[PDB]
Amino acid sequence: GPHMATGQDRVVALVDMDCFFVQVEQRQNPHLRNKPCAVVQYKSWKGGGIIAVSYEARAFGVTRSMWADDAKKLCPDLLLAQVRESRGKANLTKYREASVEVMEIMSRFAVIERASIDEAYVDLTSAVQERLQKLQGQPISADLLPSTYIEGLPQGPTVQKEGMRKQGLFQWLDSLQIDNLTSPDLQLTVGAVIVEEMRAAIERETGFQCSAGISHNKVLAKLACGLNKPNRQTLVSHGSVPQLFSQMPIRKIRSLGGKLGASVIEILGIEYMGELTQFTESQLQSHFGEKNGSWLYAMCRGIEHDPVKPRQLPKTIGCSKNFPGKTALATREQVQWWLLQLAQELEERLTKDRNDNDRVATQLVVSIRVQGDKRLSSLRRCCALTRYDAHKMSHDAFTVIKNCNTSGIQTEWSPPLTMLFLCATKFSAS
DNA sequence: ATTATGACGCT
DNA sequence: AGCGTCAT
Ligand SMILES: Nc1ncnc2c1ncn2[C@H]1C[C@H](O)[C@@H](COP(=O)(O)OP(=O)(O)OP(=O)(O)O)O1
Ligand SMILES: [Ca+2]
Ligand SMILES: [Mn+2]
């Protein structure tokens, strides 16, 4: 009852860029705007691999992970932009720099947590309190929420989408009690007003469109963001959760899309997030562990406590390359050349990071894959990173892996290497 | 031959 | 620490 926490203490948003790498390329090349188009890396094998897809191209069935040659079968007029290649490898600098553009704008409104190259969480609780005082019990006009969906509305007593959006928004606003400055529903609504402003700023100042979710925690904000993309934002209220979750496949919730989620389904014999409410906390802890069990117990009621962490910058800087099939590295000269290529990109990025962000990395992680292993990584070893020098880092990396070589001959490398990875970690202020 | 990342959990 | 899981 009255002591039952409802997880309505915070206002959290998740802002996620629409088809991000495609928009970056469309800004640069106007010929790609408002077209079926995709971003591809490499070229020789099956036309390259698609990693981002415009919404026009999605209508033809083009998806991420698809080979471009196959995408062209679905969409003959598909336009393609290629990821830059430097030092023999794909280089994602353009997209990292475009990410910084957006993150810095978001940071003007609130402290953000960078969750990926194209999305960040926002804790808007304090900003909402501030705006609520400015409003002075003034109702929120629908005009302040021009791209907002209210999940679950309209209900009860019609065929256009924009019309449906406004119907839902009007039902929501009509029910709002703006007299209570601690009403969670009102707080979410003001949160949505701020996120409209945030999204307008991003589009004005970068040219990039995005979607957003507004709710009381990160998992619901993330889920919300996806409901109406692209170029729209969605408010998921605490009250909307029972209906929303009653038909929501468990795999849709962030962190449940893999083995744990499959285990929840298998062990409990359920399909939807809402079905979790019928288990005790102890029951869930018994199957999935203390931490997961408590997290699931709360999550299926719309409650989550994970904080928005004040972190705008990545914690690591890494540079990775696969060497598939026949291209696997089978000579020491090969291995050394590619370690140097990776190290040179790493040095470049590290030097820029040090200048921009007043920090220095102190640990170098080296990872490889050997031909045969189905795991992402076969071996991961750390050594000290004491100088931002590519030849030193590549020599050090070679030192830490050189005994993985099964070959009795040391000119040759066996089993051939199908992946190399260098990562700088453990930053200190400088 | 679904690549290049990047965070956090376990023991 | 080195590995695994999940994610974008
Ligand atoms: N598996 C991947 N491999 C390489 N790059 C990826 C992968 N997934 C995502 N990216 C990159 C390209 C994306 O444009 C960018 C953001 O990813 P994501 O938010 O999942 O999709 P998206 O922004 O392209 O479309 P959406 O509008 O559906 O969000 O990160
Ligand atoms: Ca996105
Ligand atoms: Mn994203």
Side-chain angles (χ1 to χ4, degrees):
Chain A
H3 313 295
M4 207 47 79
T6 59
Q8 283 179 111
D9 44 310
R10 298 178 292 155
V11 182
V12 174
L14 182 276
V15 179
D16 178 274
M17 306 306 294
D18 299 333
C19 51
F20 184 47
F21 290 12
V22 164
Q23 286 200 87
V24 175
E25 296 294 333
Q26 286 175 323
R27 181 174 72 171
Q28 191 182 319
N29 183 359
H31 283 140
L32 305 178
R33 298 175 182 183
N34 306 297
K35 293 281 169 42
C37 64
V39 173
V40 73
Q41 53 190 3
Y42 304 122
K43 181 121 315 167
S44 286
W45 188 264
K46 296 174 167 296
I50 291 180
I51 60 171
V53 186
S54 81
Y55 280 81
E56 295 81 352
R58 298 182 194 191
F60 290 84
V62 180
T63 65
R64 172 173 297 134
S65 92
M66 194 169 276
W67 297 116
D69 287 348
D70 296 332
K72 274 292 198 177
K73 305 174 178 165
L74 297 177
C75 183
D77 299 323
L78 179 69
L79 303 181
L80 300 175
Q82 308 183 237
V83 175
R84 173 173 159 202
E85 282 171 57
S86 301
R87 310 181 193 80
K89 68 180 294 297
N91 187 297
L92 306 173
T93 296
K94 189 196 300 186
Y95 313 107
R96 290 194 183 95
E97 291 178 346
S99 179
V100 169
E101 290 184 70
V102 174
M103 303 294 165
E104 291 187 348
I105 295 165
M106 296 184 56
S107 292
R108 297 207 308 260
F109 294 79
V111 152
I112 74 177
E113 177 179 346
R114 179 197 198 271
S116 81
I117 199 166
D118 87 324
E119 78 206 77
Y121 295 92
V122 202
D123 189 312
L124 296 165
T125 308
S126 62
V128 158
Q129 296 297 151
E130 297 216 346
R131 178 69 59 93
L132 269 169
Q133 195 236 49
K134 274 192 290 179
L135 285 187
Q136 295 280 50
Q138 183 180 300
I140 300 172
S141 162
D143 297 338
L144 297 185
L145 296 161
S147 63
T148 297
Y149 279 84
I150 310 296
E151 174 60 25
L153 296 181
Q155 103 183 329
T158 287
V159 314
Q160 28 193 303
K161 189 33 154 279
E162 174 63 16
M164 284 284 297
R165 182 196 74 82
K166 277 191 174 188
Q167 289 175 6
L169 180 58
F170 285 121
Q171 292 193 348
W172 175 255
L173 294 176
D174 288 344
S175 305
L176 263 193
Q177 212 224 5
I178 48 88
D179 324 279
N180 187 1
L181 286 106
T182 70
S183 174
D185 285 346
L186 176 59
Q187 290 171 345
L188 292 183
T189 305
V190 173
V193 175
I194 291 165
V195 172
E196 292 276 9
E197 290 160 358
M198 299 183 63
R199 291 181 47 249
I202 293 169
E203 185 175 6
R204 186 186 81 80
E205 299 179 30
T206 68
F208 303 144
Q209 290 183 344
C210 61
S211 300
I214 305 96
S215 194
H216 289 296
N217 54 65
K218 291 200 290 185
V219 164
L220 290 184
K222 179 56 176 183
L223 183 67
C225 182
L227 291 180
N228 293 286
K229 46 174 222 191
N231 196 34
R232 297 292 186 266
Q233 57 183 61
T234 306
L235 186 163
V236 164
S237 63
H238 182 76
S240 76
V241 170
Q243 288 204 47
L244 180 64
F245 275 11
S246 71
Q247 298 187 91
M248 181 66 59
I250 285 158
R251 68 177 175 275
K252 300 306 184 170
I253 277 68
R254 179 191 192 274
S255 86
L256 300 182
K259 289 172 185 182
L260 174 60
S263 83
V264 170
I265 291 164
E266 182 177 2
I267 289 180
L268 300 180
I270 62 175
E271 297 174 32
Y272 306 119
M273 205 64 195
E275 293 179 86
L276 281 163
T277 63
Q278 296 310 293
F279 301 91
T280 67
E281 189 170 4
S282 301
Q283 276 181 307
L284 295 177
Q285 289 174 324
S286 80
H287 296 295
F288 311 114
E290 188 173 4
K291 167 167 149 289
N292 287 335
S294 287
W295 183 87
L296 291 165
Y297 183 84
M299 195 67 254
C300 71
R301 295 167 166 78
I303 301 174
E304 193 204 28
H305 291 318
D306 192 27
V308 177
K309 298 167 184 51
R311 189 188 51 80
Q312 190 181 346
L313 304 170
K315 288 186 178 193
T316 58
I317 298 187
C319 315
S320 171
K321 184 164 179 47
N322 288 358
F323 302 93
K326 185 136 187 318
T327 71
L329 315 181
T331 80
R332 185 169 47 70
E333 288 292 357
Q334 256 184 316
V335 172
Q336 287 175 352
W337 188 82
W338 281 107
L339 282 174
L340 178 60
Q341 300 322 290
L342 284 180
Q344 283 174 353
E345 178 184 330
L346 186 54
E347 171 182 349
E348 186 167 56
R349 284 163 59 191
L350 278 174
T351 295
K352 186 152 201 311
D353 181 79
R354 187 178 63 204
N355 286 326
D356 289 348
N357 297 319
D358 300 312
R359 55 179 192 177
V360 50
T362 72
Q363 183 177 78
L364 180 75
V365 176
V366 186
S367 184
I368 67 190
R369 189 178 182 195
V370 290
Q371 193 174 70
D373 196 350
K374 140 176 180 129
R375 302 178 297 173
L376 164 142
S377 170
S378 297
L379 169 135
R380 152 152 26 203
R381 299 278 201 264
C382 71
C383 64
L385 206 180
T386 64
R387 268 182 231 209
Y388 284 6
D389 182 270
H391 288 96
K392 168 169 180 55
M393 291 192 284
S394 65
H395 178 274
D396 290 345
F398 182 74
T399 296
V400 313
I401 70 164
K402 62 180 219 334
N403 275 306
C404 184
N405 191 0
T406 206
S407 149
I409 321 96
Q410 138 165 24
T411 322
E412 223 66 10
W413 202 287
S414 194
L417 302 188
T418 52
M419 183 273 292
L420 300 177
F421 170 81
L422 296 181
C423 188
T425 67
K426 298 193 181 313
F427 288 93
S428 301
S430 68

